Amino acid sequence: TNQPDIVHYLTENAHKKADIRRQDSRGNTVLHALVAIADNTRENTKFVTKVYDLLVIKCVKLYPDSSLEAIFNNDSMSPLMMAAKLGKIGIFQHIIRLEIKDEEARHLSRKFRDWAYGPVYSSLYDLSMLDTCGEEVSVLEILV
Amino acid sequence: NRHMLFDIVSRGSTAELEGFLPFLLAQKKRLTDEEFREASTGKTCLTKALMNLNGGKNDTIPMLIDIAEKTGNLREFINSPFRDVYYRGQTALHIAIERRCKHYVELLVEKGADVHAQARGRFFQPKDEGGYFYFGELPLSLAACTNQPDIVHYLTENAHKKADIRRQDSRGNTVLHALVAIADNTRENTKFVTKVYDLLVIKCVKLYPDSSLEAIFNNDSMSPLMMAAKLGKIGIFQHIIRLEIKDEEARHLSRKFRDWAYGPVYSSLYDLSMLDTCGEEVSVLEILVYNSKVENRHEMLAVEPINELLRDKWQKFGAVSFYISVVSYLIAMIIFTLIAYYRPMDGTPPYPYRTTMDYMRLAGEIVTLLTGVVFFITNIKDLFMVNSLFIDGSFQLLYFIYSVLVIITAVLYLVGIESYLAVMVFALVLGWMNALYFTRGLKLTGTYSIMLQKILFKDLFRFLLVYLLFMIGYASALVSLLNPCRDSSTFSKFLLDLFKLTIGMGDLEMINSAKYPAVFIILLVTYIILTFVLLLNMLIALMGETVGQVSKESKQIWKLQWATTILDIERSFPVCMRKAFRSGEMVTVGKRRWCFRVDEVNWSHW
User: Fold this and answer.
1) Environment class of B347 (CB within 10 Å of its CB; exposed 0-12, middle 13-18, buried 19+)
2) Which residues from chain B sit within 8 angstroms of residue A117, using beta carbons?
3) Distance from CA of B114 to the nearest CA of A (A)
4) Residue of chain B whose Cα is closest to the Cα of A121
5) Domain extents for chain B?
6) How far is CA B37 from the centre of its chain?
7) Taking the CA of residue A13 as centre, how many other CA atoms within 13 Å lie in the half-sphere pointing to its CB?
8) Is the Cβ of A118 closer than 8 Å to some Cβ of chain B?
């Protein structure tokens, strides 16, 4: 509903909290619904990137052991793996360009900065799911 | 230990480094010792101090000089370059300029710093050599590459030691050549490089009025104007050409001038000092055509003076060189007419050549045949490795067919068959009718069909070779079927009957279609299908060409070939006739040069 104010209220609560890791009958978490409602318009690519950054940092701060991206579906699909199926671009280009400036949630950032000798910047992208060497299925395979 | 010392400098806490100056008095250890320096690269404490910065400020930086002062290494602890190979030659002076510590650049030189240190490492090479960034290995050139004139104000004037602007590197490049190497055709990078290029030359004249900074060449004898044509950089190119300096002490090297302004008409003036080198080594315009392989050469020829400089020599060497080409073709025709009509024609070629009046026409076979040989071999070499300015590209295919029939004719009277006379007079009819392409005149407006006729000439010559190698190959195949004895004169009969089937003469000698009817048809049907697709490969290569890029490229190569041919005409004349029709005039400006007059019309500026 483009409303983080209930998201502030559901996660912290003196009565009962809201589990972010909870799936559904389709085995989809809170991130997969953001991919399903994602559209390639101007407005819808804006706030979904705001919520996607908000939930993962809140997931690390409440639970430092696991990441919210690690949980798969009934088809064993990450939110990066799902965005190639439905063909959604704005949520795809944000997960790839993921550089989180919260140092407690640093260890899952995707884009890095190696060295900057003035005019030359040395970015760094991870191939954790792009070229699966000995795994089940890749991002690039489902792209094709 | 050493490991605690290399850490706390990055921590930036001088209270955790106290008492170390009396500690070196006991153990007599210098700061530039082996254990007080990284064993792999040579990274020292001061170099580590400048990498990790606390907002660009580390208080150990005057303190590391303080401890080095009591040991007596002020010209050593600062001037110790890197010992490695990949980051070779980089000092602490290179790092402080890099991270823009203007307060700390002043601290290094006042305590004693080598200004002329060269960072000649493999990393500091250009991208063709394997490095990632190039600045000409000089800290004065490095400050110009960081878009920072503030160090350039500090290095040039200094009470301790100044910075020589004229200093080269191991590649022989000065401070201007590094600005050309870092130049990019973006919006931001074309801005400040023009600001630094004006700043350095005026400062070079004010400090040294005798010489100009543009005069110093490279190891390849290249000026900064000569270098920008090699790497194909436009923004630094268009600023050196449009160079009008309003500092009157540095007036005598300005490029653009203002002759007279009678209201709406402005009279600009561009110098041809390097654009048309009359008696010098190599020119700007020559490297724009003969050497530059950059894609931006079409835009770079569209600068202001060269669009009119190429029209200068075209109006003087265009119609003259074209009319000689018409006459020199007519000379080769009248020679061939005297060969054909004066043959004795007995029926047994060749002929006795002792007769002097028959020795004269023997020289005609030297002239005519060899011209067809040179045009035959060079175009095949040009195919593996269409100048429609003068004569359109349909002539080059037709003159090729003229060139093919000459060398076939030369074989036939050397074999011994007297039927050479049909083909010899046949090409004579084409050659006079090839002169009908001379009546167009001269073309300067580019059409889209010009690039099309290169591929027309390309694949039809491929279409003929895929024909003839197939006809010879299939005829040589059928001789291998002949296991009993067969005769070597059968191969002439296979190839004779094989040519007639493609035309449809139907006058054969061995191949009887009534013998094997069901096989002769299905080979002939598939022969139609092989030839019909190769005809469609012509049309798809044309239809797939005239859609996307022909709207730009036909107004690029036509501009490029118009510049390419006129310099090939320029190389044809000797050095004596070169000075005759040289464009440009002598206009005495200041305290005289061969510049070029350009007119303007403007209504806004007053």
Assistant:
1) exposed
2) 98, 132-133
3) 22
4) B132
5) 1-303, 304-581
6) 46
7) 12
8) yes
